[PDB]
RNA sequence: AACAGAAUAAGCACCGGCUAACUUCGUGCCAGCAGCCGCGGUAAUACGAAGGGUGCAAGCGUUAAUCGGAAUUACUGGGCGUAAAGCGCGCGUAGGUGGUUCAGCAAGUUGGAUGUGAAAUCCCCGGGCUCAACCUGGGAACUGCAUCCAAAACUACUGAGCUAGAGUACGGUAGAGGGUGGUGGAAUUUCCUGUGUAGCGGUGAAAUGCGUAGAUAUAGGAAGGAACACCAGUGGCGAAGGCGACCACCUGGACUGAUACUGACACUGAGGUGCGAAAGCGUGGGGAGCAAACAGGAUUAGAUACCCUGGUAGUCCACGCCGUAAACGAUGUCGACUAGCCGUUGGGAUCCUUGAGAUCUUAGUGGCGCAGCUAACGCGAUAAGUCGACCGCCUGGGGAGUACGGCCGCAAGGUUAAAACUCAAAUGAAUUGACGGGGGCCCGCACAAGCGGUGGAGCAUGUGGUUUAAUUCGAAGCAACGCGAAGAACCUUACCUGGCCUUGACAUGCUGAGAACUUUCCAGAGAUGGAUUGGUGCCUUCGGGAACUCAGACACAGGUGCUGCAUGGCUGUCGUCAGCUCGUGUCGUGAGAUGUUGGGUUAAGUCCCGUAACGAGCGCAACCCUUGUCCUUAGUUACCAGCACCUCGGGUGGGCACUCUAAGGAGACUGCCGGUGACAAACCGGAGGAAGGUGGGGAUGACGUCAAGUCAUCAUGGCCCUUACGGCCAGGGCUACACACGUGCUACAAUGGUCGGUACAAAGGGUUGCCAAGCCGCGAGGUGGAGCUAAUCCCAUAAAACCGAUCGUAGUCCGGAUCGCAGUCUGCAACUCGACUGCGUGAAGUCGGAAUCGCUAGUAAUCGUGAAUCAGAAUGUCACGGUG
C-alpha cells in the first residue's frame, strides 16, 4: 500500500541526505554516527523548527548544514549556540564538526514544517479541522499545486479510528517524473496517539 | 402609639434527547434506573455520591381521575385503485332528493312587538376591606319557547300549463342471450375378423406393466360415450356468474332512422324478494376419456411428494339442495361540463365518384396524451379531473371473521358477531446496494486441449495431539502449517530446578569515600566472598575542581505482565482488477438521479460518433530500470586482426582493428502499402527492418473492505507487579513421541548403472580475510606459507553432453534408511544435541486409491554454481547459468 514517496525516486527527482564513500570495514561505523546525530539535533531544536540536515564527509573530518526557518533563534548573540554545539558534537562524533545554517525562506511548502505546527495545534485542543482548513488554504496562497494532509488517530472519541482526508489541488503519485514533500510527525494527546501525514507537491519535472 | 434588637423565621425536585441547566469519583451485563426512546460487559455528562447549575417557593414532588394536544367518531373539520375500508349482482316497499312557466297561499324563512327564560355564577362599568382574594350596586347575556304584525326571493302545499327528462306506437339491422327436441364428421377406447412375427410402452436413465395362450403395427366391421378443430379477433351478447357444431321450435332485451302521441309519469333504496362459477349433498339414470382417495415401480439420509404404470367417487343427464371465491376494473348506481391523435365492432349521414373513397355524428370496445389530481406508482370523455342526489362501509397489530347466543341447512357449514390478554409496532408506494439453480454481452491455465507431480514407501521440516519439572509465547478456510527464525551444544532464552541479590544491571538529583588502574591468590558448580606486589594521575585562584570507583538514604529504576475491539506505525487481502468521486447546472415534495448512459472499439471509464449536462481530480497510458541493433568518447589488470619476437605461453615488444567494459546517443511512431469501418476511431493482411503493432521482463497496486494480523521490532492511553511478575549464575529444556495433516527431497532402474579418458558457463565473495605451489594422509585433511586489498591473487575442479569398456532388466553391480566400528574440524566444552570421512551391514520400495495442484516458450522438465545469516551447521530462502 502506497510505497514511500522518496524511496521510488532517489534518482530522476530527490538525492540523499547524506553523501560520503566508506570503504567495506568503517562503513558501519558512520552509519552509527549519522543516524544518532539526527536523533540528537530534533531533540535539542524542538523550537526553531529544522527540516533536512544534510551531512556531506570531506577529506577526514566532517561537514552539516542544519536548516531552520528561523535562524536567529539558533544563532543567538552571535553562535552561543553554534560553538556550544561544536564543541558537543565531537563528543558524539569525534571528528572535528562544521555547523552551517541556512534559510528556509517560505516555510508553508515544506512538510516537516508544516506537520510539526499540526502537532502543536492539535495538542493546544484545538479542533481537528478548523487548525487544518486552514493549514492548507494558507499553503496555497502562496505556492504549491496540490496538498494532501491525512490525519488519522484517536482523534478525541472513545473508540474512533477515523481518517480526515482533505485536498486542493492535483497530486500525482504513479509519475516518478514529479517532485513531491512527505513527512510523518506524530502528537501525543492526553488520550491517544495522532499520526499526520503530509503530501505537498511542488512543480513538476 | 411606645419599647427590645438583625435578633424570631428555607427548603424541594431535576440536570442523555423531547426540556431550562455538568463535570469529576465509586460501580463494572453486578447492584440498580425509567413518561417514552432505552442506558450498565472496566475511562458511565442516564445507576450511587461530590462540587456546580437551573426551575419553582411556604411549599415542592409522585400516584389516581376528567377535558385538551387527538382533523384519533371529523356538524363546524377526515376517508374507501394498491396502506384498514365499495355488499357477488339485480328488482323494489318505508324513507331521502325534484326539469320548466304563471297564479294563489304563508306551513318553513327573515324583520319587529309582547309574555317568559328564579336569585346566584360567568362577562362589562363602577363602589367598599391599607392592596388583593372577598363583598357589593347598574347593565348585557341566558342562544330558548309561545302569542301577534308585516314582507314573498327560495323550499313546501294548492290551481293551471310547457316539452328539453322518461315511456309508447313505426320501419330497420346485429348477436356463443335463454329453453325444448333433432342430426352430423374427425379422433379415443372396448369387441369381432384377416394378414403377419418379436418385442411394445415408458423415462435424466430405468423399473412396475403388456407380449408367441400371437402384442404393437395393419385392414374390415359393430357398439357406445362426452366434447365441438380451422373460422376466432384488445370480436360479440348478457344485470352479474356465464355463453362457441348445424336446423327447426318457442322467447327476452339492445341499437338506428323517420314521425305522431302521453306531459315530469324521474332518481336511489334500510329492511324484504330473486338469479347464485366450481367442489360438495339427496333419489334415479348413464360409464368413452380424464382422474382426488388408493396400489405398485423409481428417486431419495428419509419422500406421505414431484416423475412412471394402473385406478374409484366424481366430471355427464333429469329433479331438489347448498350459497360462498383473487365472485377483480382489488374502482356502488345515476346525471352534467372539460385539449388532442391512432385503432376497431354496427348504424345512419353528407360527398366529386372510380374508390384500396372522404369528412362528420351517435352506441360500444382498445393504445398514447395536456390541464388537473395523487404519498408515489399511475388514471386522464370507459377519470382516480371539476360538481350534484341517495346508499354501503373503515378506526393500530395479534387475539379473530374466532368463541358463546340467534336464525337458516339433511349434512358439510354459512350469516350476525365480542371480550380478557399481549406487543410498540403492523402495512403502502418508491430509492441506493447486495443477492438469483432470471435474462443479455465480455474476460481469465476457468474448462477443453497437452506435459508433469501430490495422496504409496523412505528420510527432511512445520503444525495438531500426547507427555513432562518446563516442552516459553504469537500466526487458524482460500489470506496457516520450510510460518516470525537470514542458523536453539551453552550463549541466544523469554520457560523449568536451584544457588543469590534489594535505590538495584542501568537514569537523574543527595551524603561520604578514594585517581583511574594493576593485582597475576585461595575458597566455592559458578554467582560471589576475601586476600592482592603494585598505581597515585589529571586542570590547578593551589583553595580545590572535574574525572572515574565504593557505601548510605529518598524520589525512583525496571517489566518479553493484560488490552491489535483504546490507538499510531508497518504489511497481507480482494486485484494490477478497471474502476471510484467532486464542482457548477437542470429534473424530483424527498432519499436519489444525471454526467459515468447509446452505437462502434479497446489489454483499459482506452478512444470515436452521439447526447441536459459542461468540466476537473484519482486511476489506466507514458515518465524509471533491464535485455536485444547501431553510432560516438575511452584502452589497463581487459583485447590479439596486422607486425616482429619467442622458450611457442599475448610469453614479449607492440597495436587501438576487435571482443569486452560503461558513458552518452539514435531506432518503432500503425510510420508506410493494400483492403476493410460512418472512411472514425480502429481492424485484417503487406513491404522494409536487429526488433511490428503496449518487442520480452521488473518496480509502480485507486476510493475501500475484512474492528484481518502484530502491545513480542519499535512508539503510546490505561491497568496491575515494585523484598519481585524485577535482577544474577550454574545444569535442564524448546531437538520428548502409539498417532493424524501440510509442504519438500531422493528413489523404485537398461532414454539406465559403473570404470577409464575428455568439452564448453554465468554470477558472486575475500587485509580481523582468501588461505595457493610443494608436502604428508584409504579419505575427510595436516603441514607449508605465497600472492592479495583486487577485471591482477585466491575462492574455483561447473555438471548434464560426448568416447571406450563392462552391466542383461535380477529386489538387481537397483535403492540407499537403519546400525556396529574407526577417524578428522570448529569450539572452554560434540552425553542428552553438530557436520563430514573410512570400513561393514543392508531394509521399505517393482510408478503409487478416491481425489488434486502447477505451467502457454528460453516456458515446463532435468543438471550444476554462488551469496546472505554464520566459530561450527541447508533437502529451505534468495540469486546465475547449461540442455531444452
Same mark, same amino acid.
Given at each position: 500500500?502506497?510505497?514511500?514517496?522518496?524511496?521510488?525516486?532517489?534518482?530522476?527527482?530527490?538525492?540523499?541526505?547524506?553523501?560520503?564513500? %566508506?570503504?567495506?570495514?568503517?562503513?558501519?561505523?558512520?552509519?552509527? &554516527?549519522?543516524?544518532? =546525530?539526527?536523533?540528537?539535533?530534533?531533540?535539542?531544536?524542538?523550537?526553531?523548527?529544522?527540516?533536512?540536515?544534510?551531512?556531506?564527509?570531506?577529506?577526514?573530518?566532517?561537514?552539516? /548544514?542544519?536548516? /531552520? %526557518?528561523?535562524?536567529?533563534? =539558533?544563532?543567538?548573540?552571535?553562535?552561543?549556540?553554534?560553538?556550544?554545539?561544536?564543541?558537543?558534537?565531537?563528543?558524539?562524533?569525534?571528528?572535528?564538526?562544521?555547523?552551517?545554517?541556512?534559510?528556509?525562506?517560505?516555510?508553508?511548502?515544506?512538510?516537516?514544517? =508544516? %506537520?510539526?505546527?499540526?502537532?502543536?495545534?492539535?495538542?493546544?485542543?484545538?479542533?481537528?479541522?478548523? %487548525?487544518?482548513?486552514?493549514?492548507?488554504?494558507?499553503?496555497?496562497?502562496?505556492?504549491?499545486?496540490?496538498?494532501?494532509?491525512? =490525519?488519522?488517530?484517536?482523534?478525541?472519541?472513545?473508540?474512533?479510528?477515523?481518517?480526515?482526508?482533505?485536498?486542493?489541488?492535483?497530486?500525482?503519485?504513479?509519475?516518478?517524473?514529479?517532485?513531491?514533500?512527505? &513527512?510523518?510527525?506524530?502528537?501525543?494527546? /492526553?488520550?491517544?496517539?495522532?499520526?499526520?501525514?503530509?503530501?505537498?507537491?511542488?512543480?513538476?519535472?
Amino acid at each position: 500500500q502506497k510505497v514511500h514517496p522518496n524511496g521510488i525516486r532517489l534518482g530522476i527527482v530527490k538525492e540523499h541526505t547524506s553523501v560520503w564513500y %566508506a570503504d567495506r570495514k568503517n562503513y558501519a561505523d558512520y552509519l552509527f &554516527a549519522d543516524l544518532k =546525530v539526527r536523533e540528537y539535533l530534533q531533540d535539542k531544536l524542538k523550537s526553531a523548527s529544522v527540516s533536512r540536515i544534510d551531512i556531506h564527509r570531506p577529506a577526514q573530518t566532517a561537514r552539516i /548544514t542544519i536548516h /531552520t %526557518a528561523r535562524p536567529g533563534i =539558533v544563532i543567538g548573540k552571535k553562535g552561543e549556540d553554534v560553538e556550544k554545539l561544536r564543541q558537543d558534537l565531537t563528543k558524539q562524533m569525534g571528528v572535528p564538526v562544521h555547523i552551517n545554517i541556512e534559510e528556509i525562506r517560505k516555510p508553508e511548502l515544506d512538510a516537516m514544517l =508544516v %506537520a510539526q505546527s499540526v502537532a502543536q495545534q492539535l495538542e493546544r485542543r484545538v479542533m481537528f479541522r478548523r %487548525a487544518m482548513k486552514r493549514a492548507v488554504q494558507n499553503a496555497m496562497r502562496i505556492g504549491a499545486k496540490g496538498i494532501k494532509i491525512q =490525519v488519522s488517530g484517536r482523534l478525541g472519541g472513545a473508540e474512533i479510528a477515523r481518517t480526515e482526508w482533505y485536498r486542493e489541488g492535483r497530486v500525482p503519485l504513479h509519475t516518478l517524473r514529479a517532485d513531491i514533500d512527505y &513527512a510523518t510527525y506524530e502528537a501525543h494527546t /492526553t488520550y491517544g496517539v495522532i499520526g499526520v501525514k503530509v503530501w505537498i507537491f511542488k512543480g513538476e519535472v
